[PDB]
Design a protein around this ligand. Structure first.
Ligand SMILES: NC(=O)C1=CN([C@@H]2O[C@H](COP(=O)(O)OP(=O)(O)OC[C@H]3O[C@@H](n4cnc5c(N)ncnc54)[C@H](OP(=O)(O)O)[C@@H]3O)[C@@H](O)[C@H]2O)C=CC1
Ligand SMILES: NC(=O)C1=CN([C@@H]2O[C@H](COP(=O)(O)OP(=O)(O)OC[C@H]3O[C@@H](n4cnc5c(N)ncnc54)[C@H](OP(=O)(O)O)[C@@H]3O)[C@@H](O)[C@H]2O)C=CC1
Lengths: 1216, 88, 88
């Protein structure tokens, strides 16, 4: 029993296995087992591995070993030379089994490359190594450098060149990779069985030939017709791969945000929340003339109860739960702290900071409790390193919840507001008070001390109530015992006067509807002569002036970028990107982007009042839009998945393998674009769950197992249904999948009209079970009257159908049930059955019962659905000339052995799979349809027992089905049946289901720069959503193997992919492109993914670089907008892709940010007009600034969400 | 390989196998969906050699044909074959 | 093969016996209850003594010696009997 230890330490020779990463986890290569078994056999025979031409056979892999990042795993190999069998077991668990033996006489002819089916077109394009492994990585394979053995491969994947590095494991794994490259099945697939493998080291060394470079390569050929892979001295035949679960944990969770304009000063922020209004109403009702769980209502009730009026100070001072610092828990005091207003103020604070590192100190943090909010709001900023310290009045205050301060990067402090700040805190950038709950000593003294301890240009945030407002008066009446609290409440004008007395100026003011406000003031920096540089000029010649002005590092005069002539100028992104480059601190922006033509345009002249006001504010970002000065701010996006009313929805599991994720989703049938002769749309009333549906929902069966062509992101739940056809006629049908939905597109061949004496509920249970029963028994089984049958699990639907069919012919029946309840139910159901007709289905005891009661001669026909050892017992019950019907699918999938000695009894073994009809053999199926129709007419077919669940409780129905205690059929009602026979109004009622993006087949879509990597992935995604007419624009056309492969594959599927190569930079080019799209059909959507990058600091860039960068992105978007606004009335999507740089800023990409900002501005302009428009900001794309690359799967999943959002600009990225 | 090539990698609907051991497995692998295997040999059956059940995943029927089961006495099924041969 | 619960007996590298063997985790004594014979055989006045059964076996070609002569007696139809135990 040879033992091998697999290590991954860099020292061990086994370290190369670290590169065999699948689905983000390291697994032992399927060929590593073969390598170790070959070594063991060579050791046993005494030969070396290089002198032992070996043959494997019937190799089977039972589980995949996971190599841990640390430690080692030991594998035991055992050989039975007499039986020529081996075995690989890990920790006493079987891993691999098969047959291995020496090759007595190698035949080099075996390795001759098979005849090529293709005519050798000699196409000039081939899939290079980088493209091959890019495709594999997109599929889910993450092979590292060692396992990157493919140099070239034909577009079809049937031939290529493989590297040789004296490593058999890598070479054979590379052969397996080549095998998977050509497959059209998406997802992750791993080997499970290999019929036979031949290895001949001598022929291998003969075949190797060195390229012009010293690298050694070996040609490979893959033949799916013959199902063999050959390369060098290896020859793999009968490889079988099974779909992996393709699930990873700890997946990326991108930060999704919306990028919207936010005025500097706004009022009535909480006007929406009804809870705040109701609480205010209750409080005012309590405090009339001088009933809930909230702090303030409870305090008011206590005050009323202690004394109706004139409450003593002492009695109300010491009240349980009153002196507790739980008071800020009241929604009204925290109304703004939860509102985005706080986030907007914080974002304004971090912006204008000279360095990405910010120093923030909190005063009276013990009672304010802002430490539990501020750290959580600045986390989204990737590169922001925040220095936070919490200061209080006395150490005993805040002495609790020290672990909360421990988890956050915050520190305690002691600084009375009147007392001067300690030297440790010194100058600070952001200072937060929370005066509403915390009682500052005195306004004047407190603010003076803060400003003294505040860094130059720093910001002061003050959350306080306003005197003269109802809530202010209420709080004034209460807590009169706390004079420090009374001094902390004043009118708005009083706050203005106090701010004026000190140097602080008001820059932001967020005000609620009930008085509570959120002040934001900063200490003005010593003024100096400013420089105003217009940037609205075309040709970017102002870029030269900006380059010159910033040249003088010694100068520190502020630089103001002015843009007023054009509302689409992307000066915002320019400033964001430049502020990171050296000397960018001086930059400041003023933008005039009023979004309505009628909006007044204020003057920005130096003498103008507005310019002086903004100069006093001294804010880097200064945007004016429709009579309101503000700036664009990121806000976190709501987590709820959008839902809309619809009449075409289907049930699906949002998270694979979880029954809690079942929910209704919008269906592609809404467009009805695939409607045509030979198919029709039928409204669904009742849908029947089946064992397959439970297996799929539980995740125990992969969707790829379901035969047919199915999209990866699709639902395959439901095969039966009952409802009304388009003509209003009651009907029941059979569908391969997607039958569990409000509507179904079905061919008329698979429809039966329910008899008048039935009900749509009853008819929902007949199709599948009776179809399979009739097929298996009559067609395949050729059952005859008077014979003997064994029907397993007679309680199940198929069992009941088979029993009903058999008893119609008088055949003697034996059946197996799993309890006495089911036995009694069957006895009542079929009076013909007697006591001796039942056996136990949970053990092999039924075998003895059948043989005994049949005289030991067995039965004539077996309809088995059991598995493994119970399957073998069933076979032994067959009589001479018996017939075995196998509707089960476990042993067939596992390929368990079957002793052929049974056939000496002259029996026949049937493998029945009903699903084969929906794909091919359609002409044959009509026999089964006729059989079912005749059975319905003759009364043989009886509807099963039904358990109806409403549509709103599909999850409950699935859970009930999961339990094996259900008897009969489980049908989920979708629409209550009407009391009429034929009804014209068969349209389904509206449902609120998760919105999903689907496209009609009679519209064409344009992807400018679509031949790029993100371009091609988006195109692939659109095709899966029902796009038949597609146009891709590329300046240089198709010039790579991957592009040609994808384009050819799409056309092979019937899609009309057309490469245009008409630059959108020139308006004429845009018009030509749109007209070309109109040829295929009306334009449905346009996506602008063109990009040209010319990076580098501002000192290096030139006006020509800006021209080039903005030509495809800015000018192209403008041309597309102008043309589509003129000749695209059916346009649905006008999407443009941006980058996080425009919004966060990256050094050396000023032009890129400018172009992206211009795109965002034009998109915002379009939406205000009611036309479609969307600008997406991406962090980094992986498969094709403090963030991490985002996997393309996640990128497309996120994009699916944005298209169904009502916002103009959205962003997504993954933090580091 | 010959059959799988000239049949476009599909297979053969019907197989009348009289070979044994390894050649039987290869004949099995030549089956197509809805294929039917007619095993008239007896060596493999007598030895109870294993048969992989994965083939049945493809809609497939496996027949153990034994003409010797009729010679014991005349049966209504035998007269069918007699009439077939007379018609031929 | 503990992992595969399989055994293999060899002689000079030649396979002799093969199969599966494993411990019986949960022995149920009910498995050893004698099944009821189809024929009641009520009277049962005659049976094969030890001499006669082995005389028949010898006539059939079995030449068991004294140690393997364990059948103490059997019914005329061989449906029952009384075997001998000698801790072997
Ligand atoms: N050829 C084909 O392609 C087709 C095959 N099928 C498949 O055949 C199978 C049988 O169909 P059907 O009878 O309607 O399915 P059910 O799920 O209704 O099967 C019910 C029976 O299965 C057994 N069973 C159910 N739950 C459990 C459990 N938790 N533990 C143990 N045993 C359990 C019981 O048999 P018992 O009472 O003996 O314990 C029970 O009576 C399904 O997988 C179905 O998809 C059906 C139609 C088409
Ligand atoms: N990490 C990323 O990839 C990120 C991507 N983006 C944006 O996403 C989009 C897709 O980028 P991606 O595909 O990854 O990169 P590519 O480099 O592949 O994008 C450029 C593609 O567009 C074509 N193109 C360039 N300029 C024009 C033009 N004026 N007219 C028509 N076609 C043009 C190019 O063809 P040709 O060379 O012949 O002109 C090429 O096919 C771009 O807009 C990019 O800025 C932003 C954030 C992250």
């Amino acid at each position: 029993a040879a033992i091998y230890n697999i290590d991954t330490s860099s020292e061990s020779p086994d370290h190369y296995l670290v590169d065999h990463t699948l689905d983000g986890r390291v697994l032992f290569p399927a060929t590593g087992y073969l390598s170790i078994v070959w070594k063991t056999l060579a050791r046993a025979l005494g030969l070396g591995v290089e002198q032992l031409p070996v043959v494997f056979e019937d190799v089977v892999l039972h589980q995949a070993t996971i190599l841990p990042k640390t430690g080692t795993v030991s594998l035991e190999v055992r050989l039975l030379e007499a039986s020529r069998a081996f075995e690989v077991s890990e920790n006493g668990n079987l891993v691999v089994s098969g047959k291995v033996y020496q090759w007595d006489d190698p035949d080099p002819r075996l390795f001759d490359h098979p005849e090529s089916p293709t005519p050798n077109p000699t196409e000039p394009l081939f899939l290079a190594q980088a493209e091959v492994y890019k495709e594999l990585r997109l599929r889910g394979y993450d092979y590292g450098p060692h396992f990157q053995g493919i140099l070239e491969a034909s577009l079809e994947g049937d031939s290529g060149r493989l590297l040789w590095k004296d490593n058999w494991v890598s070479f054979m794994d590379t052969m397996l990779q080549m095998s998977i490259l050509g497959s059209a099945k998406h997802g992750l697939y791993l080997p499970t069985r290999v019929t036979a493998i031949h290895i001949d080291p001598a022929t291998h060394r003969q075949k190797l030939y060195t390229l012009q470079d010293k690298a050694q390569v070996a040609d490979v050929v893959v033949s799916r017709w013959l199902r063999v892979t050959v390369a060098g001295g290896v020859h793999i035949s009968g490889l079988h791969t099974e779909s992996a679960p393709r699930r990873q944990q700890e997946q990326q969770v991108p930060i999704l945000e919306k990028f919207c304009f936010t005025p500097h000063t706004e009022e009535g922020c909480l006007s929406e929340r009804a809870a705040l209004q109701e609480e205010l109403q209750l409080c005012k009702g309590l405090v009339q003339a001088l009933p809930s769980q909230q702090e303030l209502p409870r305090l008011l009730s206590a005050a009323c109860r202690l004394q109706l009026n004139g409450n003593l100070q002492l009695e109300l001072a010491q009240v349980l739960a009153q002196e507790r610092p739980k008071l800020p828990e009241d929604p009204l005091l925290s109304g703004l702290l939860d509102s985005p207003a706080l986030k907007a103020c914080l974002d304004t604070a971090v912006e204008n900071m000279p360095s990405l590192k910010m120093k923030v100190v909190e005063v009276l943090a013990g009672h304010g409790h802002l430490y539990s909010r501020i750290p959580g709001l600045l986390s989204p900023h990737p590169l922001l390193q925040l220095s936070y310290t919490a200061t209080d009045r006395h150490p005993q205050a805040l002495e609790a919840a020290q672990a909360e301060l421990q988890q956050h990067d915050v520190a305690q402090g002691q600084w009375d507001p009147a007392d001067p700040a300690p030297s440790a805190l010194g100058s600070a950038d952001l200072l937060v008070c929370n005066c509403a709950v915390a009682a500052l000593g005195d306004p004047a003294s407190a603010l003076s001390n803060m400003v003294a301890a505040l860094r130059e240009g720093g910001f002061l945030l003050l959350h306080t109530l306003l005197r003269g407002h109802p809530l202010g008066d209420i709080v004034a009446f209460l807590t009169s015992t706390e004079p420090q609290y009374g001094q902390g409440i004043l009118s708005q004008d009083a706050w203005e006067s106090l701010f004026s007395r000190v140097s602080l100026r008001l820059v932001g003011l967020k005000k609620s509807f009930y008085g509570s406000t959120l002040f934001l003031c900063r200490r003005p920096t010593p003024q100096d002569s400013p420089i105003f540089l217009p940037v609205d000029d075309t040709s970017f010649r102002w870029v030269e002036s900006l380059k010159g002005i910033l040249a003088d590092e010694d100068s520190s005069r502020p630089v103001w970028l002015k843009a007023i002539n054009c509302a689409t100028s992307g000066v915002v992104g320019l400033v964001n990107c430049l502020r990171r480059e050296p000397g960018g601190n001086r930059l400041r922006c003023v933008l005039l982007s009023n979004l309505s033509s009628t909006s007044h345009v204020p003057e920005v002249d130096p003498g103008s009042a507005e310019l002086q006001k903004v100069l006093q504010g001294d804010l880097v970002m200064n945007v004016y839009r429709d009579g309101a000065w503000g700036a664009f701010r990121h806000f976190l996006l709501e987590e709820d998945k959008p839902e809309e009313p619809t009449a075409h929805a289907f049930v699906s599991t949002l998270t694979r393998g979880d029954l809690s994720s079942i929910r209704w989703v919008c269906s592609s049938l809404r467009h009805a674009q695939p409607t045509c002769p030979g198919a029709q749309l039928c409204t669904v009333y009742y849908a029947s769950l089946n064992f397959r549906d439970i297996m799929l929902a539980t995740g125990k069966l992969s969707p790829d197992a379901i035969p047919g062509k199915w999209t990866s992101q699709d639902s395959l739940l439901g095969m039966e249904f009952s409802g009304r056809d388009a003509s209003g006629k009651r009907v029941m049908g059979l569908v391969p999948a997607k039958g569990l939905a409000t509507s179904v597109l079905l061919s008329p061949d698979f429809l039966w009209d329910v008899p008048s004496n039935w009900t749509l509920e009853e008819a929902a249970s007949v199709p599948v079970v009776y179809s399979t029963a009739y097929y298996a028994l009559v067609v395949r089984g050729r059952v005859r009257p008077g014979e003997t049958l064994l029907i397993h699990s007679g309680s199940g639907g198929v069992g009941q159908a088979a029993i009903a069919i058999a008893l119609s012919l008088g055949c003697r029946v034996f059946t197996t049930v799993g309890s006495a309840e089911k036995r009694a139910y069957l006895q009542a159901r079929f009076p013909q059955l007697d006591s001796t007709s039942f056996a136990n289905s949970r053990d092999t005891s039924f075998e003895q019962h059948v043989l005994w009661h049949t005289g030991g001669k067995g039965v004539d026909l077996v309809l088995n659905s059991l598995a493994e050892e119970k399957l073998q017992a069933s076979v032994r019950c067959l009589a001479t000339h018996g017939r075995f019907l196998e509707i089960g699918k476990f042993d067939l999938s596992q390929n368990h052995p079957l002793g052929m000695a049974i056939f000496l009894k002259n029996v026949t073994f049937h493998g029945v799979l009903l699903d084969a009809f929906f794909n091919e053999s359609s002409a044959d199926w009509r026999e089964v349809w006729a059989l079912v129709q005749a059975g319905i007419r003759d009364g043989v077919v009886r509807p099963l027992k039904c358990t109806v669940f409403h549509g709103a409780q599909v999850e409950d129905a699935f859970r009930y089905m999961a339990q094996g205690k259900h008897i009969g059929k489980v049908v989920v009602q979708v629409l209550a049946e009407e009391p009429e026979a034929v009804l014209k109004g068969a349209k389904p009622k509206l449902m609120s289901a998760i919105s999903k993006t689907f496209c009609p087949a009679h519209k064409s879509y344009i992807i400018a720069g679509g031949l790029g990597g993100f371009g091609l992935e988006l195109a692939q995604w659109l095709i899966q959503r029902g796009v038949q007419k597609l146009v891709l624009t590329s300046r240089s056309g198709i010039r790579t193997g991957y592009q040609a492969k994808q384009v050819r594959r799409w056309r092979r599927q019937g899609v009309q992919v057309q490469v245009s190569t008409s630059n959108i930079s020139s308006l004429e080019g845009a018009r030509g492109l749109i007209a070309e799209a109109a040829q295929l059909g009306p334009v449905g959507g346009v996506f602008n993914l063109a990009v040209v990058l010319r990076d580098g600091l501002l000192e290096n860039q030139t006006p020509e670089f800006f021209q080039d960068v903005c030509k495809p992105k800015y000018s192209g978007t403008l041309n597309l907008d102008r043309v589509t606004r003129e000749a695209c009335p059916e346009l649905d999507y006008f999407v443009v892709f941006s980058s996080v740089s425009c919004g966060r800023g990256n050094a050396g990409q000023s032009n890129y940010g400018f172009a992206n900002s211009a795109m965002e501005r034009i998109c915002e302009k379009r939406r205000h007009e009611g036309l479609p428009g969307l600008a997406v900001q991406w962090g980094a794309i992986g498969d094709v600034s403090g963030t991490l690359p985002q996997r393309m799967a996640s990128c497309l999943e996120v994009l699916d969400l944005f298209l169904n959002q009502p916002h103009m600009v959205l962003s997504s990225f993954v933090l580091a």
